[PDB]
Every structure is written in C-alpha cells, then in structure tokens.
Design an enzyme around this catalytic site. Structure first.
Site, PDB file in Angstrom:
ATOM      1  CB  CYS A  46      -0.841  -0.083   1.337  1.00 46.17           C
ATOM      2  SG  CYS A  46      -2.014   1.451   1.529  1.00 46.17           S
ATOM      3  CB  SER A  48      -0.189   4.080   4.306  1.00 42.69           C
ATOM      4  OG  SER A  48      -1.493   4.496   3.677  1.00 42.69           O
ATOM      5  CG  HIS A  51       2.602   7.682   2.747  1.00 41.54           C
ATOM      6  ND1 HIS A  51       2.859   8.315   1.609  1.00 41.54           N
ATOM      7  CD2 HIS A  51       1.166   8.106   2.960  1.00 41.54           C
ATOM      8  CE1 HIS A  51       1.920   8.675   0.732  1.00 41.54           C
ATOM      9  NE2 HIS A  51       0.776   8.584   1.414  1.00 41.54           N
ATOM     10  CG  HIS A  67      -1.109  -1.191   6.448  1.00 41.78           C
ATOM     11  ND1 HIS A  67       0.115  -0.668   5.692  1.00 41.78           N
ATOM     12  CD2 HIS A  67      -2.113  -0.674   5.912  1.00 41.78           C
ATOM     13  CE1 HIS A  67      -0.589   0.073   4.896  1.00 41.78           C
ATOM     14  NE2 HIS A  67      -1.759   0.209   4.816  1.00 41.78           N
ATOM     15  CB  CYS A 174      -5.207  -1.524   3.797  1.00 43.79           C
ATOM     16  SG  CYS A 174      -4.990   0.027   3.627  1.00 43.79           S
TER      17      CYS A 174
END
Ligand SMILES: NC(=O)c1ccc[n+]([C@@H]2O[C@H](COP(=O)([O-])OP(=O)([O-])OC[C@H]3O[C@@H](n4cnc5c(N)[nH+]cnc54)[C@H](O)[C@@H]3O)[C@@H](O)[C@H]2O)c1
Ligand SMILES: NC(=O)c1ccc[n+]([C@@H]2O[C@H](COP(=O)([O-])OP(=O)([O-])OC[C@H]3O[C@@H](n4cnc5c(N)[nH+]cnc54)[C@H](O)[C@@H]3O)[C@@H](O)[C@H]2O)c1
Ligand SMILES: OCc1c(F)c(F)c(F)c(F)c1F
Ligand SMILES: OCc1c(F)c(F)c(F)c(F)c1F
Ligand SMILES: [Zn+2]
Ligand SMILES: [Zn+2]
Ligand SMILES: [Zn+2]
Ligand SMILES: [Zn+2]
Lengths: 374, 374
Positions: A46, A48, A51, A67, A174
């Site tokens: 993902c 994120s 990030h 995650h 997610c």
C-alpha cells in the site's frame, strides 16, 4: 512445534528513511495474554507503507512495516477467544476493541486503541515482540505484516473464511475496504449521482468500484498519470481527466463538466492541494467531499471556509469507515460470493524476498497492487 | 393610494463602510413583473448587517441593508401568484426559485439565484428599485429591509399566517431559523448527545434551542462575554465556559469536559480560529462540526486534515439548511402553535429611527436582538 517458543524468521526491516528494506532474520517472541502470532501468507504493498519510507508518515524507526495482509494463526496467547491455531486471519491496522466510546458508537470505527494518531510502534502493552541484531524493532499499526511471522493484539485480528484465497483477500485488510467503504459507507454515494475520484491507485480504484456499486451515473477519474485511466474505466469510471492537460484548475474543469459541481468527490492521493481542489469541485450547496489520502506529516492546508458555509460537507475516514473486526469477515464472505472483484487491483505478484522490487514498481507508477507471497 | 406609483419613504442608507446609517427619504419604484412591494413592519438587527458596516462582508455600496424582517404586501407586479396585497410576508434573503438544481435537491437550500456568493446588490433583473438624492442605491440579498418599503422578487418572499405578530416572527427571517435549523436539520443533533455552541448571540441561542429540542443531554455554551451565559442557560445550555478563564486552549478544555470530544459543535461567531477550535473539539472519529458564523472576506483558515481523516464531519450552511419559501411559513405556523419561543432572543425594541442606537447595543455586547419597528 513452535508454540511458546521464540521464532527466528525473515522480515523486511526498515532501519532508516529513504532506504531499501533489509530482508534479514528477526526473532519473534511468543504471544502474551490476548495476543496472536500469525504465519503470514500474503501482503499487499500500500502507498501508506511507502509513506513510512519517505517520511510522509512518521512512525518510530527501526520498524517492520506492512498492514495489508492475510495469514494463518500459528499460536494464541492466554485468554484469546476469537481465533485458534490454523484459522485464516486478516490483521486489522484499525483495531476494534469493542469497549471504547468509538467502538460503541453506531458510526464510529477509529477505535481509541489505534496506533495511528500518535504512533508508539508497539503492542498494546507498550513493548515489542521483535528483535533484530539484538536490537528491539518497532511494530507498525499493531500489524507489522512485512514478516514471515508477526504478533498482534486480539483486537487487531479477524478470523475469516477457512476457504479464503489469502493471496486475494489480503486486499480487504486495507486498500479495497478503504476505497469501497469510503464510497458506500462514508460518502453514501446515491443512485444517479456524479462522483469525482482523485487518484487512481488501488484505493481510488476501490472507490470507483463502490461508486459504481452504489449506482452512480457518472464517475470521473482524475490522475496526472494517464496510464491509470484504462483500468479506472474497466472498474467503472465513465471518463478520466488529467489536470496537466488543462489551462484552468481542475476544480473549475470538474465544476463545468458536472453542470455546477459533483455530488461526491474523493481525495485518494495524499496532497493538501488536491484535498482543497476535491472539496471545491463538489456542488457548493449539497456536495460531499471525502478525504482518504494520507497527508504529509504535521502540514496544514489553507482553505476559505465559505466553501463550507454554502452547504458543502467535508469528511475523512480511516479504513472506509468500517468497524474492522465486524466488517472484515463479512467482506471476505461477500468476496467468496462474487459480490465484488479484487483481481482488477492486482497487477503484479512477487515473492516476499523481492519486496524492494515491489516498492520500485509502485514508485515508478507501473503497479496498482503488488501482492507479496511468503 | 400607492399602487403603480413611486413611493417616497424613509430608509436607512449606508453610503460608505464604517459610518452610521443615514435615515433619509428614498424613492421606491413600483414592482415589475414577478416583484412584490412590501410595507415593512419590523426588522431585526443581525450581526451580518453589521458585517456590511464593518467591511467583514463586501457588498456593493451605497446600500439599503437589512435581511431579517416581516411586513405587509403593498402591491404586486404582473404575474405574481404566491402573495397578494394585504398579506403578511417575510422576505427571504436566500431565495427559493424552485427550478435550479439546488432547489430540486432534497437537501439543498442555497438557491442559485442567491445574491450572497457574488453580490450584485440588485433585483433579479440586474437593476435597482431604490434611489436617494438622485443616486441609485443597491439592494442587499434581494431583501433590503431597512426601509419603510422594499421591493423583492417573488422567489424572495413567503406568505405567512395573517394573525402573525410581525414584531416577533421577523426573527424567522434570519437568526432563529438559522440557528435552530443548524442544529435540527444540518447537524441533525441526536437525543442524549453532547453539543458545544461557540457564540451566544441571537443565532447561537437559537442553536441551543434546537439542540435542546433535539434532546441533547449536554449543551456547553462558549463565549468570551460572560454576560451572555444567563440567557444561554435559560434556553437550554447545561454549562457555559469562557475561554479567557483557562490557561489551556478551549478545544482541550471541551475535549476533557466531554470525556474525549463532543458529538456536535457549532461555530456561531465568524472567526477563523474558532472554526478550527470548534472542529477540533468534536470527537475525532464521529464528531460533527457546523460553521454558521461569517468571517472576514477573502481570509483562509489553516488546519491539519488529520482532523478529518480520523472521521470528523465538517459542514456549513446558510439559513439553517431550510428551503426558504417552503420552510418560513411552516416555522411561523409552528411558532403560532407554541412549538418554540422567540421572546428569549429579543432584548430591545426600538423605533426604526433609532437604527444606529440598535447597532451600538449589538457592538457593545449588551443586546441579543433589537427589533426595529416602523
Ligand atoms: N484513509 C485510509 O484508511 C487509507 C487507506 C489506504 C490508503 N490511504 C492513502 O490513500 C492514498 C492512495 O493510496 P494508494 O491508492 O495505495 O496509492 P497510489 O497507488 O500511489 O495511488 C495514488 C495515485 O495518485 C496519483 N496522483 C499523484 N499526484 C496526483 C495529482 N497531483 N493529481 C491527481 N493524481 C495524482 C498517482 O498518479 C497515483 O495513481 C495514499 O495517500 C495512502 O496513504 C489511506
Ligand atoms: N449562516 C447563516 O445563515 C448566518 C445567519 C445569521 C447569522 N450569521 C453569522 O453568525 C454569526 C453570529 O451572528 P449573531 O448571533 O447575530 O451575532 P452576535 O449577536 O454578535 O453574537 C456573536 C457572539 O460571539 C461572541 N464571541 C465573539 N468572539 C468570540 C470568541 N473569540 N469566542 C467565543 N465567543 C466569541 C460574542 O461575545 C457574541 O455573544 C455572525 O458571524 C453572523 O454573520 C450567519
Ligand atoms: O493505508 C492505511 C493507513 C492510513 F490510512 C493512515 F492514516 C496511516 F497513518 C497509516 F499508517 C496507514 F497505513
Ligand atoms: O445573516 C445571514 C447572512 C449570511 F449567512 C451570509 F453568509 C451573508 F453573506 C449575509 F449577508 C447574511 F446576511
Ligand atoms: Zn475501541
Ligand atoms: Zn493502507
Ligand atoms: Zn433555486
Ligand atoms: Zn442574518
């Protein structure tokens, strides 16, 4: 054969921002009370997670990120009642303790036990289950799915159908659930409406899926990478626009295209400017805009509150507004019953050991979701 | 007899910002097709009228302001079907054309024929019905109620109960309906909830009234003027707090008081800082914050979008979200049926000739609503 024992396994450790993950041996402690140790089977990449690498999202380092995943319970700690060894599970990066004022609220999902708002990078008890080179390593969102084995709190795991294909349903942990729920649950997209979706990655594609499921008549995809448009149309976009093609700001383009503003807009990128653009492009009296993208750490946006005074609604959500432990098994059951598709999100498959290539694919713009297999 | 003739009457003309109103003779043209000329009976002094004086609101000058009022139809233009000479009426500063996409939408009220967004200060036909000392004078929001006689477009007037006390129901033309609707229609306050109301003037008191009518268990008034607290408690506030009494920011105080954030918050002042405070003090996962106040022209606020990503909803509205021409007659009927009270909002009743004194009472903090009587 491993219950109550430390497990040595490979994980992708992030020692430093803006560096490759290091695939190397870690020690995974056995689960304490109300903990669950999971043998990972598949994990998605993902944005994120990226990030964390880029420092867009600040969380303590060194860390085991990941995650969006699915696996099989290896062992349970004392007092665990909701999963057993051998069960298929999805880790829940948004927990569902079931006891806090948010879990008790009919529309809350951002459980107060989360590790997102002010990340500690620990288990619920404030300690780590991971050691690498003799050093403690942080968890991420209570999940840390970039590891052959992880340990999660019981409130951060959901039991799913025993016949689930884990290399598909990891996306329910997610990107699918976030995008789909942002449309169907958070925005409550209506039949016949016009939607605008900013960002056509895995999450924005999932938003389009939801807007189409909700009956939207027009779904306008917005991306600066026109290579994203074909797949967006396949999952329901009626038309796609690239802001770089226009002399005028895209909020003005979308307001013109929609004869006065869209019913629903979604920011699914993570930029302050596109959050304000996305609000502006929804109709001023009754439009709704949903922030889904993760903003850069500690930065504020600037906006004119007259955008709201006229009647707009602005909201955001984590994980599509879904109460995570209640919703994830139902979403897997619905996937099993072909109520939605996950294959359109999966563009690449790699072994876990090629995690860095998976991140390269995301950063180049090539991939939607790469699924890593352990 | 006046029908078809120019009327010379008294009005309060604002020739320039930051000066007193000039009470003097104006000429009021007869109504054209689809226009209504109204003999004013009573008009309230709303803070929005003062914003025109202070420059907080930009609108073409010179102007006849006033937008909260009630009167009696003197004459109608060709084609008018919804009022007749002798009818009691309330001018509608938010029109209801019935034909635009907003008027057709179940939840829209900010009709596209409004003169707020981009004010022209004219009738719908782009001309003025007012002159003074040989000069054309602008309208204000299609209403211009600070005059013995006004002319409004049919879409900007509602017929009300012939037995209405106009010195009370004028408040249904702005402050009561705005605050009450902000609570019951825009926020949709729930039974048993905790509310925070920032600003305890006429509008904020009407927000309290709505929160109490909706069954809120706790209603926390917030004002820097503690003289406003007794009336706030009379109409339903359970607690009042003055930010100036605290070492901590009031969002922190209110979060603590509400054991993790309020259900519903309302900004009813017009300050950028209080809009962000009000959003922050609502619970991060399921809170709702409504902007009602009007801040200084062309100023942006700064905020961290993580406030929204966790799950908050931020919205604003004009006129409490009410579709104006459908709602105003029903609100007057409900007042006549004793469903709500207006007397708590009325602190002063002055002749129209004392308009300046009425604005000085508002600016000094003394008054809630002054009603001017013609
Ligand atoms: N709220 C949540 O629970 C949640 C869940 C999952 C992801 N996220 C966030 O959502 C965002 C999208 O995640 P993803 O789909 O995995 O990422 P992604 O695959 O990187 O997709 C983002 C898309 O945005 C496009 N884009 C970049 N800049 C612009 C621009 N200026 N204008 C228009 N398009 C542009 C880009 O080309 C790409 O296709 C990221 O910020 C994630 O961190 C939030
Ligand atoms: N959205 C709409 O349709 C609409 C309708 C009517 C009024 N308005 C606006 O609503 C606002 C309130 O109008 P009103 O009730 O007539 O005004 P008002 O009677 O002046 O009341 C404002 C209140 O705010 C208080 N106040 C001022 N600064 C602060 C502070 N920093 N913290 C807390 N309290 C503070 C002040 O003491 C006063 O009691 C104004 O900005 C109006 O322009 C909007
Ligand atoms: O992609 C889901 C996701 C988020 F929505 C966040 F807000 C965040 F902080 C995070 F770490 C995360 F993984
Ligand atoms: O008080 C009502 C009111 C408003 F809410 C405005 F936004 C505005 F611009 C204005 F002139 C006005 F009178
Ligand atoms: Zn909880
Ligand atoms: Zn994610
Ligand atoms: Zn209209
Ligand atoms: Zn007003």
């Amino acid at each position: 054969s491993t219950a109550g024992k430390v497990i040595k396994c490979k994980a992708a450790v992030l020692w430093e921002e803006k560096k490759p993950f290091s695939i190397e041996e870690v020690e995974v402690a056995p689960p304490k009370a109300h903990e669950v140790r999971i043998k990972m089977v598949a994990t998605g990449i993902c944005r994120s997670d990226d990030h964390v690498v880029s420092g867009t999202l600040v969380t303590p380092l060194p860390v085991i990120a990941g995650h969006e995943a699915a696996g099989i319970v290896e062992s349970i700690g004392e007092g665990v009642t909701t999963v057993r060894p051998g069960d298929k599970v999805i880790p829940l990066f948004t927990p569902q303790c079931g006891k806090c004022r948010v879990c008790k609220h009919p529309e809350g999902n951002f459980c107060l036990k989360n590790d997102l708002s002010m990340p500690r990078g620990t288990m619920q008890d404030g300690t780590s289950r991971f050691t690498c080179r003799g050093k403690p390593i942080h968890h991420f969102l209570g999940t840390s799915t970039f590891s052959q084995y992880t340990v999660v709190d019981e409130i951060s795991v959901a039991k799913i159908d025993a016949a689930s294909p884990l290399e598909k349903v990891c996306l329910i942990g997610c990107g699918f659930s976030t995008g789909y729920g942002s449309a169907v649950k958070v925005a409550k997209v209506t039949q016949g409406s016009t939607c605008a979706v900013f960002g056509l990655g895995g999450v924005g594609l999932s938003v389009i899926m939801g807007c189409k499921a909700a009956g939207a008549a027009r779904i306008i995809g917005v991306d600066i990478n026109k290579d994203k448009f074909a797949k967006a149309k396949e999952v329901g976009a009626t038309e796609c626009v690239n802001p770089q093609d226009y002399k005028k700001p895209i909020q003005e383009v979308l307001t013109e295209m929609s004869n006065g503003g869209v019913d629903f807009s979604f920011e699914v990128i993570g930029r302050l400017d596109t959050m304000v653009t996305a609000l502006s492009c929804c109709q001023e009296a009754y439009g709704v805009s949903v922030i889904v993208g993760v903003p850069p750490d500690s930065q504020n946006l600037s906006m004119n509150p007259m955008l709201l005074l006229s009647g707009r609604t602005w909201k955001g959500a984590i994980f599509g507004g879904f109460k995570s432990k209640d919703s994830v098994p139902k979403l897997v059951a619905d996937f099993m019953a072909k109520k939605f598709a996950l294959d359109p999100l999966i563009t690449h498959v790699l072994p876990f050991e090629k995690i860095n290539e998976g991140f390269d694919l995301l950063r180049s713009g090539e991939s939607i979701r790469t699924i890593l297999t352990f």
